[PDB]
Amino acid sequence: VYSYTEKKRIRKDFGKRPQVLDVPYLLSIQLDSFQKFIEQDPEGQYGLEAAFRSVFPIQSYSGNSELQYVSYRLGEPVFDVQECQIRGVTYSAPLRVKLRLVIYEREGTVKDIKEQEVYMGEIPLMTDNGTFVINGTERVIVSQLHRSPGVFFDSDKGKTHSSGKVLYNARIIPYRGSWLDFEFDPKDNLFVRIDRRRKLPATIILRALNYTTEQILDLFFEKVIFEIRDNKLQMELVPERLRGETASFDIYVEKGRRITARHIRQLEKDDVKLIEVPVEYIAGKVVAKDYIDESTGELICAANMELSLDLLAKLSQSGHKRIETLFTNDLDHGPYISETLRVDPTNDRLSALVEIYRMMRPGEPPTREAAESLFENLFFSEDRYDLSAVGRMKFNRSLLREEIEGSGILSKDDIIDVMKKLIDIRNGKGEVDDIDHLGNRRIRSVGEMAENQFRVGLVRVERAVKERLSLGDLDTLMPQDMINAKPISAAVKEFFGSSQLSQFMDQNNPLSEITHKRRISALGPGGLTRERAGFEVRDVHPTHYGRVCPIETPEGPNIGLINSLSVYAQTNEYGFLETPYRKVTDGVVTDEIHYLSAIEEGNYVIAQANSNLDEEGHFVEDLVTCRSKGESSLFSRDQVDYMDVSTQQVVSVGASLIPFLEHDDANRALMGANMQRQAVPTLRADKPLVGTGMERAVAVDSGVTAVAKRGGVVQYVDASRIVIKVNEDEMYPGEAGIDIYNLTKYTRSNQNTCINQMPCVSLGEPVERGDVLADGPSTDLGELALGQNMRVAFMPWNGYNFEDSILVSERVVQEDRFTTIHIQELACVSRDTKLGPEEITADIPNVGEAALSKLDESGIVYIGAEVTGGDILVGKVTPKGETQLTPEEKLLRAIFGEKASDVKDSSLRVPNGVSGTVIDVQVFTRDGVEKDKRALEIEEMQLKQAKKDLSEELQILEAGLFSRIRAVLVAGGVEAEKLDKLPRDRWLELGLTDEEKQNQLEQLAEQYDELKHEFEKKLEAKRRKITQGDDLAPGVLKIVKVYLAVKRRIQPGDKMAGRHGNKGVISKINPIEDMPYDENGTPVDIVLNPLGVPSRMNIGQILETHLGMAAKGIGDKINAMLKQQQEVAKLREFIQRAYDLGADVRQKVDLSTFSDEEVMRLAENLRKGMPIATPVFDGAKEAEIKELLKLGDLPTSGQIRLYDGRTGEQFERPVTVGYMYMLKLNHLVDDKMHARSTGSYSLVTQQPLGGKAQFGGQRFGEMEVWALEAYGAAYTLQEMLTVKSDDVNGRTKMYKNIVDGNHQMEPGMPESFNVLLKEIRSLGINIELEDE
Amino acid sequence: GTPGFQTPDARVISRFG
Amino acid sequence: VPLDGGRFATSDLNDLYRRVINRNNRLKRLLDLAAPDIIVRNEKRMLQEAVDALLDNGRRGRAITGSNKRPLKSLADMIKGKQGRFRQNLLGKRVDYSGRSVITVGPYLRLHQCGLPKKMALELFKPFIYGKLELRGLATTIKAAKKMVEREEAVVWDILDEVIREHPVLLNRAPTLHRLGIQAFEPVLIEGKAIQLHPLVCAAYNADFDGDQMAVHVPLTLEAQLEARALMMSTNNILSPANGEPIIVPSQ
Amino acid sequence: ETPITANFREGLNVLQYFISTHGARKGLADTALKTANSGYLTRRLVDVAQDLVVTEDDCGTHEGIMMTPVIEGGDVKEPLRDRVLGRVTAEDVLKPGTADI
Amino acid sequence: RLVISIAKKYTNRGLQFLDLIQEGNIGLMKAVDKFEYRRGYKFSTYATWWIRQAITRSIADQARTIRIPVHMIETINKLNRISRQMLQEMGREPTPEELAERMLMPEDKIRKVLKIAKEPISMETPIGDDEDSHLGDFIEDTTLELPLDSATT
Amino acid sequence: TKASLATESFISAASFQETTRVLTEAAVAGKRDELRGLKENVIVGRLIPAGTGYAYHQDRMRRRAA
Amino acid sequence: ITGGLPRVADLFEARRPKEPAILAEISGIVSFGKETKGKRRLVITPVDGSDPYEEMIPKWRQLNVFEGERVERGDVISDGPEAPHDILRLRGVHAVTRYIVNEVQDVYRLQGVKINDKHIEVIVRQ
Ligand SMILES: [Mg+2]
């Protein structure tokens, strides 16, 4: 069966693959991150708890007075979302923390403790849709993709000296702290870099960890025992050592015959553990440990020292036999560490620590204390260094360890293992990591970044607490005096209010809202700059599969640094991206879902999304294309481990809305993916004729719609609110009743567009849960509708669509189906000045009566009165004084007696070019400023409306609850007639004989009086928030905001685009008579250009057209049978045939539902055409489109004949026509056209301003100056940079000449040049000008 | 034939092969 | 200067000069106060630091403005760079008598003309319109003509036709690669807010009708009106200077 | 090694489309960042050239340069007419028969 | 060394660090010249008092670009201290009329003291879109009279 | 870029690149600039010495320094 | 090189190539040096008059010039990419002004771009 919303209008689905995994909540990322941030976790794991347990406790300097952390709480917000928007203040929650102060008096061990909860800053709260309100605007904190912590092994091949030799380096990158580099040297030496500072040979750190030369040599090179026992030095032998090196003398093997794989195995049978060699070879070996003579005590040979015949005789004549040597192999086990020990000056621990210290802080002589403390802080202090869960996990996993959870600080074993791994990579056994591998990139969402910023705010105050806890007193103080909310909240405030990743939520489109919160930016703090990232990091990596959309991304300078999140992509427990897959067990595809991360998927081999998976759950083909190593190739049907979940798991939510995406080029697919989210809602909402089925998964998951919480029956329908009578089985036991929904009506959005919710259900209608109660902007019965259905025909037309221009019929602009309603907020601010406070009085000088006719006694535009540019909305007059008049003007003052005024004019006048209608006027009056007439009128209006809405909600709940009371009061005990005799308050007093129903009565009465108390308190709070004097900026009297509603039609110059990346601007609205038509006489809506199809690939726009025609033809049929009013039989049969088209499609439509009525309604909503769902990579093929065209009595080729309206003679060569989905982008021409003759100018340098913003002067850069220089145009260029921008005198001279009919310029000196002369002269430089 | 660069033609990769 | 609302807006130069003055004054005071060396040497170094940060900040230590991690811009920084004075002000400036809008096709145009919206024409040619209205006795004084053009009286439209006649206007595409990025056309008054462009010139501008925007400039002097007709005219430039081949050629 | 068997009309499958995006990205990205560097190049070019202007009618030198067709390998990349047209001869070209004009 | 020990406490008040340490050295000298070694007390205390005064008052003098009378800085600091202490009392922040109660001053002056505290914003402050445009750009010149009016003159 | 680094006019050079160094060197040199060119002429807002500017500068300069 | 646009930037900047080719300074049979000390030695042997010129070359660099053969000035003893300074000095102004144009025209010829040699020639002159 189908859910109610589907039975209202069914979308015919194509595509054979049945979807196993359901579309996840697209806003789960942000919501889950913030839920992690606020939820209380009783361990050090993620959250505010972690941030507190990190810095706390705060113990004084040896005073043993630590300020412990007990717990935290989040109180209710002081203002809700609506009031935070209207007032403009952040929507946050007060943060109360319970602190403890303990002191241990030395009669010993007494422990004093004090505890109180102190307020430390406020944390902003996230809305239900995954957004915050920082300053009255819904914002979004974009997730960040940064470099994961842990160890990373980089080649740095090539550029290193052009020698061909490839060095290596390892880089330990913590989550918080300094970096640790271990790099190589062209001479095969090892160097270690604490931060990007000096090189410092590697051993220097091993000595700082208390490792002697003997131990250092024993930790890298294998000991080889060489002794002169009895004579003819023997060698304790592992037969494998000789394997790699070249032979030198006779054993088995004679001199000069390098050891081969034959002799290695020849040495095993006889078990050769001993072989004697000549003396010269040993001379090329090193000694592992120090050897001193036993009697003299002097040293014979030190550690890491060469060996010679003379020194060998020294140690032999002393009685020494055992000789430790290093197993140095030039090919496999190099002398790396030994060759480095010779470049290391410090042979001990303290000297190495001193070297490190001087490398860190040069010029400051080091001591034991300073060096030890600096080192331990550097890498071994929880306070200064952390290698958190992700870092430690990747660190142990990369090092091939077992425990993936260790300490957050490094240890000696960690450093030694990282060095061993680097040296192994240098030896040939190992792998260098990929910087662009998605297994090495983490995702830090809003919650984690907020945690980090709050922790930063917590650490900056630690110094103060440490100060007051050492120099502070006894119980005289409590754990409050040393706290301050400003430093704690400063970091959080800065982060949320102004950050690279904190940006205004993208409204004007629900799809834009959903795709913005799913963004993953590589920029911002901790990331990299556009100018800092190379070309490689921006490319598509093979690991982007199923995680990020390879298409969706901006085509500007941020290519590859912004990409979106795939449909089924998800965040794994630590920081990485994982995609869903299905397990293949025996030969079958299970319905189990395994979420594999990048590295995880790396090992297995997964099947392909598009393949012969159907049917019966068994792979058909013997060879199926798959990917195992990130490489694609045909693998055996036997070896399949996993398979893709759906064909759309590789694209984003925006790319999945593109029908026939398989027929479009990647470039144009990206273009369309962005332009689609650039679409603004139309006046009427119109379902897409050809969709992908994802429209429901977007229009619902976006908070733009209204979805029922609990199922039931609609009690009351209204354009304002909706009252739903919940079912008896879905309601709570104690309280009401009904579900009340208050729809949003004509509210200004971020992009100044209009967001509004319209009810899509009528009175007394059944509604389950999950059914949309009211459609928001760009939504049709729960389906996302970003544009309109247009009848398109591909043919040139008098060059009116020459390059990409779009020829649109006049009917389209007639029907207002592309008209857009915008809302603008403009405010007049009356603030105090030197001459005195400004005034909002309607009394303005230098104005006519026709202008002031539209203002009230207080001077504010009347509500509902429509105005245009230039009209005064809020009359204001700023006090200006010391007026002086040219005697010519004093003559006028004396003649006509028109006296001058002592006040200037600042007024809220409608912006030039726009003409709307006033829908809202708000007045914020400061405290102490007397309320004018309009202010009191609006205040009384607000009070009345507030009490009205409150009492109406109260009455709805009251009636529902009293019906419940009757329910329980008329069973067990029966009262029917008498019960409706007495008033309803008497119902509350009555009681029943049997318990378990008297209990229900008590529950109902309790919750009833509870709701009454709640309503009373809420009404009192709202009245207080109204009457209370508003809080305004420091020195402003009043702020009168005016909201204008501008209805903008579609005119030449507005940008139009489809979903396939096809863009264009409208040349002109062509009359209906001149629009080409078909034989039936129905004109065409839009005339595109065929030449746009072959140049781009962009083939979808063709198919989406053809199929569209088919999907439209059906409608005609269903209209005819409804216009001919035959019966439900013909409708049912034909619609069955329509829903049963093609081959191997998953659709469940049998017209069993409400046989006569439900089918009638279904057809009533299908007369406009049958919507068709076209999956991303599983969309309908050509043959099914041909069939659907056949059913619609339409040609197979999808091409008909067209007649020109002007001539009437048909066009040769049949023209393709159909229906395409067109989007109106926000690049309207009304917001782009601007012109300027003479405006204001900049203060320091006299040049016309760039604002604000239409009246800014156009920019004439160096390139335009070169263009003027290429032609010989001296006067044009001079007047361009002298009269029109600079030359304070020349502007006025030229203007007067122009007004006098004389066109001649007297050029002067550009003011910027004199400013430059002054600036240069402001130095010890003297620059002047000569004679004349 | 002309560095595109998406697919090769004769001597170099190209925008259109 | 007071930044309204309320808060004041100063130059970092002021903070640098303030520091310099404070330090010179403290040095004078100490001199008269007879302080020992270490103090006065530290003060001398502070004064040198302040002076060097005032002249060319960043070479030594990058002194910072209060309430910010942003360094205060010094004198030398107000001259060098793409931003700053030389590149951004003297070699290029924002210019009066100019406009911007979205271009679209009108093929009916001749190669020497382009469709220009009337709304833009009124604003651009405002001084010409004022003078012409005052010349023919249609306006008593300049203010009367201002109010007339503000009132959208019919009589002014004809006047517009009179002042635009045979007055070339420079059309410019946002990116200017070569001199053909700017060409002069003969204005053709049109309704709507879209600018009509001739197709044959699109190849020269390298401009499509996919939403690209173009700017307009009105030549003021008689000499500029002649240079926009004999040198930069659309018809006086057909074949490119880089190669003899004509840049004006039928496209699609 | 695994080419795109399908043509745009038949429709791509997920794997081949993903393979195509690889080359698609380098194409899109190359245009954006090149925009920044081409400006630098042309700006340096205009900087090294500005003051050079046509100032004289004739210099009076026979030096010039020898213009010969760019005949690389088998055939010609650009004929001589195109590398000579619009310019002035340094000395009298004779007919292939020497000593003529 | 004691001068730096004292000056490190005040660092971030719109005044550079060496300015603080030097203004403290001045008070240290003034303490040296006015100290009786016979009182038996340790010179640390007297030097501390003098240096603390010489740093705080110097801050009041040389921090703000617009110099403010010395007592007004004290008043501002007192108001800020009271409004800081009352945070956990009022829950979020105190009502303005209360400070006039908690403070000795009547209420009508408190709003003037808060309107006075506004500091100048650098004209180099980046603007919306985090672009190269700065606050020193959007400032017009209003002293100029537009030519449309000079022609009428 | 290197050939452009060397120019008679110090204003023209200080405009294009390395303003600090060019200006310092031209300061110690006491060098002088008659502007003799395009960029320096647009800097002071004059007729560039080319095209129409060439026709005007020819007549003006013929009578100067002679 | 890369090449392309960066190549054009390299040619107009006269940037020394990675492994430059060196050029003979005067006519005459070439002569060898002492031995491999650091790089190697190479003795110029002019035929008639002044014959003291010399240079030093690395033995790691392979050689191409003939030993007992006459080799005029501006000849390739070693295969490799040439530098503008070397061409100008060992061939003349016209040779280098032709090399610059012929090399910078290949990158523009690869792409469908056609520009007369005159502008490149004016740049080379500057
Ligand atoms: Mg374009």
For every residue of A623-672, DSSP letters joined together read: EEEEESSS-EEEEETTS--EEES-TTTTSBHHHHTSTTGGGS-HHHHHHH
Cis peptide before A991 (omega within 30 of 0): no
* Structure token digits, residue A1124: 């001919």
Does the distance separating the beta carbons of C90 and A1234 come in below 8 Å? no
The verdict on D3 touching B (C-beta cutoff 8 Å) is no
Instruction: Tell me the shortest Cα–Cα distance from B2 to chain G, in angstroms.
Output: 6
| CA atoms within a 13 Å half-sphere pointing along the CA-CB vector of A1201 | 8
Does the distance separating the beta carbons of F37 and D50 come in below 8 Å? yes
Residues 6+ apart with CB under 8 A from A734: A1003, A1004, A1006, A1007
Cis peptide before A837 (omega within 30 of 0): no
Tell the burial category of A128 from Cβ atoms under 10 Å away from its Cβ (0-12, 13-18, 19+). Answer: exposed
CA of A804 to the centre of ligand 1 (A): 9
- Please give the C-alpha separations between residue A550 and each of A481, A695, A923, in angstroms, as whole numbers: 54, 21, 49
Three-state SS at A792 = strand
CA of A1063 to the centre of ligand 1 (A): 10
Per DSSP bridges, beta strands C113-117 and C182-190 are parallel
Alpha-carbon gap, residue E5 to C95, rounded angstroms: 57
Q: H or E element: which one contains F58?
A: helix F52-62
Task: Give chain F's count of helices (H) and strands (E).
Answer: 5, 0
Which of A718, A734, A736 shows the shortest CA–CA distance to A726? A736
Judging contacts by C-beta atoms under 8 Å, the chain F residues touching residue A1246 are: none
Query: Running DSSP on this structure, what letter comes out for residue A1052?
Result: T
The verdict on A1070 touching C (C-beta cutoff 8 Å) is no
Tell the burial category of E135 from Cβ atoms under 10 Å away from its Cβ (0-12, 13-18, 19+). Answer: middle
Across the interface, which of D17, D29, D33 has its CB nearest the CB of A662?
D17
CA of A1264 to the centre of ligand 1 (A): 19
In the PDB record, what is the listed experimental method?
X-ray
Q: H or E element: which one contains A722?
A: strand A721-726
Which of A296, A565, A312 shows the shortest CA–CA distance to A443? A565
Does the distance separating the beta carbons of C33 and E122 come in below 8 Å? no
Instruction: Tell me the shortest Cα–Cα distance from C80 to chain F, in angstroms.
Output: 5
Query: Running DSSP on this structure, what letter comes out for residue A120?
Result: E
Does the distance separating the beta carbons of E62 and C22 come in below 8 Å? yes
Does the distance separating the beta carbons of F51 and A1274 come in below 8 Å? yes
Residues 6+ apart with CB under 8 A from A518: A26, A29, A564, A565, A652, A653
CA A1051 to chain CA centroid, Å, is 34
Chains D and G touch (3+ CB pairs under 8 A): yes
Per DSSP bridges, beta strands A441-444 and A143-147 are antiparallel
Query: Running DSSP on this structure, what letter comes out for residue A1196?
Result: S
Alpha-carbon gap, residue A67 to A468, rounded angstroms: 11
Alpha-carbon gap, residue A112 to A100, rounded angstroms: 10
Q: Using the Cα atoms of residue E62, residue E68, residue E71 and residue E72 in order, give the sign of their dihedral.
A: negative
Alpha-carbon gap, residue E77 to E55, rounded angstroms: 15
* Structure token digits, residue A742: 């208050």
**Strand-pair partners of A721:** A742
- Please give the C-alpha separations between residue A1290 and each of A601, A1260, A1307, F43, in angstroms, as whole numbers: 72, 18, 6, 16
Number of neighbours of residue A72 by Cβ within 10 angstroms: 20
Q: Are A1220 and A1101 in contact (CB under 8 A)?
A: yes
**Strand-pair partners of A767:** A712
Kindly report the three-state secondary structure assignment for every residue of chain C: CECCCCCEEECHHHHHHHHHHHHHHHHHHHHHHCCCHHHHHHHHHHHHHHHHHHHCCCCCCCCECCCCCCECCCCHHHCCCCCCCHHHHHCCEEECCEEEEEEEECCCCCCCEEEEEHHHHHHHCHHHHHHHHHHCCCCCCHHHHHHHHHHCCHHHHHHHHHHHCCCCEEEEECCCCCHHHEEEEEEEEECCCCEEECHHHHHHHCCCCCCCEEEEECCCCHHHHHHHHHCCECCCCCECCCCCCECCCCCC
Chains F and E touch (3+ CB pairs under 8 A): no
Number of neighbours of residue A1294 by Cβ within 10 angstroms: 28
Does the distance separating the beta carbons of F23 and A1320 come in below 8 Å? yes
Alpha-carbon gap, residue E128 to A828, rounded angstroms: 21
Q: Are E19 and E58 in contact (CB under 8 A)?
A: yes
The verdict on C244 touching D (C-beta cutoff 8 Å) is yes
Helices (H), A330-367: 336-341, 349-360
Across the interface, which of C63, C72, C146 has its CB nearest the CB of E122?
C72
CA of C206 to the centre of ligand 1 (A): 8
Which of A920, A926, A901, A896 shows the shortest CA–CA distance to A843? A901
**Strand-pair partners of D71:** D76
- Characterize A1197-1211 residue by residue with b for buried, 16 or more Cβ atoms within 10 angstroms of its Cβ, and e for exposed: ebbbebeebeeeeee
Does the distance separating the beta carbons of G13 and F3 come in below 8 Å? no
Q: Are A675 and A1061 in contact (CB under 8 A)?
A: yes
CA A824 to chain CA centroid, Å, is 26
Cis peptide before A1252 (omega within 30 of 0): yes
Number of neighbours of residue A193 by Cβ within 10 angstroms: 18
Alpha-carbon gap, residue C14 to C54, rounded angstroms: 9
Which residues of F, range 2-61, sit inside 8 Å of C by Cβ? 14-15, 18-20, 23, 39, 42-43, 51-52
Q: Are G44 and G30 in contact (CB under 8 A)?
A: yes
Which residues of D, range 27-86, sit inside 8 Å of B by Cβ? 27, 30
Strands (E), A833-916: 872-874, 908-909
Which of A1054, A1057, A1053 shows the shortest CA–CA distance to A1098? A1057
* Structure token digits, residue A406: 């260790």
The string of DSSP letters for G8-26 reads: HHHHHTTPPPSSPPPB--S
A820-938+1036-1048: CATH class: mainly beta
* Structure token digits, residue E132: 């190269």
Q: Are A320 and A362 in contact (CB under 8 A)?
A: no
Three-state SS at A1292 = helix
Three-state SS at A558 = coil
* Structure token digits, residue A1214: 């049949």
Using N-to-C axis directions, what is the helix angle for E70-85 and E108-116, rounded to 10°? 110
CA of C111 to the centre of ligand 1 (A): 21
What φ, ψ does residue A705 adopt, rounded to 5°? -90, 180
Q: Tokens 């009427």 label which residue?
A: A684
- Please give the C-alpha separations between residue C87 and each of A294, C90, E132, in angstroms, as whole numbers: 81, 6, 14
Three-state SS at A898 = coil
Using N-to-C axis directions, what is the helix angle for A1274-1281 and A1262-1270, rounded to 10°? 160
Cα distance from N-terminal residue to C-terminal residue, chain A: 94
* Structure token digits, residue F42: 């647009």
D64 assigned to a ligand binding site:
no
- Adjacency order of strands within the sheet including A138-141: A132-133, A138-141, A502-504
Query: Running DSSP on this structure, what letter comes out for residue A408?
Result: S
Residues 6+ apart with CB under 8 A from E53: E27
Binding residues of C for Mg(2+): 208, 210, 212
Number of residues that make up chain E: 153
Does the distance separating the beta carbons of F20 and C91 come in below 8 Å? no
Judging contacts by C-beta atoms under 8 Å, the chain A residues touching residue F43 are: 1313
Q: Are A458 and A55 in contact (CB under 8 A)?
A: yes
